[PDB]
Amino acid sequence: GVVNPNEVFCSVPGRLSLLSSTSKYKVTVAEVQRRLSPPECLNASLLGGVLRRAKSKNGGRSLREKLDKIGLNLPAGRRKAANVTLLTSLVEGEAVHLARDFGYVCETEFPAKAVAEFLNRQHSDPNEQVTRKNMLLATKQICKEFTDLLAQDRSPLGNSRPNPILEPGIQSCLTHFNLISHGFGSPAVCAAVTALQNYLTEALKAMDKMYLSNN
Amino acid sequence: VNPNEVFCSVPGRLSLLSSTSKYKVTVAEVQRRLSPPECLNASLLGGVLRRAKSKNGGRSLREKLDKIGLNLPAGRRKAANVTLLTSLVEGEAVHLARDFGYVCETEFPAKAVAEFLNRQHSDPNEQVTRKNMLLATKQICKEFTDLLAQDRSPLGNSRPNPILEPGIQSCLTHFNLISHGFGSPAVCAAVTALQNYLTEALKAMDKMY
DNA sequence: CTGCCTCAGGCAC
DNA sequence: GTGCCTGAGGCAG
Numbered sequence A: 001g002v003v004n005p006n007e008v009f010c011s012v013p014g015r016l017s018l019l020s021s022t023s024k025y026k027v028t029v030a031e032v033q034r035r036l037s038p039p040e041c042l043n044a045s046l047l048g049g050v051l052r053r054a055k056s057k058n059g060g061r062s063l064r065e066k067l068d069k070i071g072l073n074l075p076a077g078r079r080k081a082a083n084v085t086l087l088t089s090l091v092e093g094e095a096v097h098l099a100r101d102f103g104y105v106c107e108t109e110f111p112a113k114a115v116a117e118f119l120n121r122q123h124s125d126p127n128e129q130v131t132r133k134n135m136l137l138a139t140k141q142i143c144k145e146f147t148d149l150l151a152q153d154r155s156p157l158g159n160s161r162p163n164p165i166l167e168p169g170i171q172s173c174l175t176h177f178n179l180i181s182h183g184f185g186s187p188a189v190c191a192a193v194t195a196l197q198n199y200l201t202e203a204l205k206a207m208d209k210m211y212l213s214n215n
Numbered sequence B: 001v002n003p004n005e006v007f008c009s010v011p012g013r014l015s016l017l018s019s020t021s022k023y024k025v026t027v028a029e030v031q032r033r034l035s036p037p038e039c040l041n042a043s044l045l046g047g048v049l050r051r052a053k054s055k056n057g058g059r060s061l062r063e064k065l066d067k068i069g070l071n072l073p074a075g076r077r078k079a080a081n082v083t084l085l086t087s088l089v090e091g092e093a094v095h096l097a098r099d100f101g102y103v104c105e106t107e108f109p110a111k112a113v114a115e116f117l118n119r120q121h122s123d124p125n126e127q128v129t130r131k132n133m134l135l136a137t138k139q140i141c142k143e144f145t146d147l148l149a150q151d152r153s154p155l156g157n158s159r160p161n162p163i164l165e166p167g168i169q170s171c172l173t174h175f176n177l178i179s180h181g182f183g184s185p186a187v188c189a190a191v192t193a194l195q196n197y198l199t200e201a202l203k204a205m206d207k208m209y
Numbered sequence C: 001c002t003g004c005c006t007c008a009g010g011c012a013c
Numbered sequence D: 001g002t003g004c005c006t007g008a009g010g011c012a013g
Ligand SMILES: NC(=[NH2+])NCCCO
Pocket: A039, A040, A041, A042, A078, A079, A080, A081, A082, A083
């Protein structure tokens, strides 16, 4: 079901779409309150760029009035954050979409098999093959435990506030990374670790099949 | 960059409040977009170059390309594989990867993640095992990211001599071309978060010793 | 998908 | 920081 329109602040065209490939992203009031709250505390001018609004006369005043109507208070004098990154420009829907597409290219285009063959060839002495296999297996297990923790993150995103399944200490730390990255961070880290995991799988498989590979 | 080699300058898609100067897009970058594996057409390249959608704007861009010696036919179909990364100019793709690397280094909670994951393995008899698994992971990840750092895929106006053999270099170049340069440095950026966790987990284990 | 005409934001200041 | 006015691209169709 549709997000209640009363909980939607505006809709924002994606910055990274070619040829109208995506519908405008809905920006919830919850998302706006995340941007205005610690740790970023964006001001009217930075939030206007995130929402991709025209810089018109009294644009700041008109945005701060819109925020007052929904109960958010943004002081006119609030300091301009200097620790902004390229990720700060994103609305949460686009940030998550960008992480999903990163996941997609790491799964479908990253050359895990060629990388495995190259790195197996750098450590190809008979006397190191048992150690290399155990190191590859341990790396797979430690990486999976790490991505399994990130997958248990229940940071608020869009209009959802799911019940946390992690203890409040580690959840607040993961939420910090969610808020500075606009939701890109944990999923993009998991996307990259799939490329690593595919390399490790292909590396163990090429060791297993070494005889049939040389024929 | 020699102005003869600059096709056009493009404002960044991900800048807030005029934070970045326009990115130069070279002839060599446009040639990469027009060639396999992407083979962008006038309409997609127009969007990468952030050009107005005008009547016969396709025809103007194709005539601009023909003058600098790139052939883009009128009838070229849209590319088969388009992601959000396809919108990026190479300069902004590389900048975005470096920014991802900066937030992994400065905002990822490596110490809280290490404390939490160590606490899931508190059997006194598995600490030597866990320590070796963490060391093994740090070494395997480092060899992996050292390979990606030896990538000498052409970007912008640069065409450095490859240090890797041609087989592995063509496969890394494939990942460079579909990601417009973001891919390998972004994988490296994310492994920084993993490496800082592994560092903090070994340090916390050694403290408890 | 084409491309007009709104309005985002590049730019001067 | 402000906000005009050029031109990218959202949206109509
Ligand atoms: N990121 C920041 N804390 N910037 C300054 C915010 C204005 O109080």
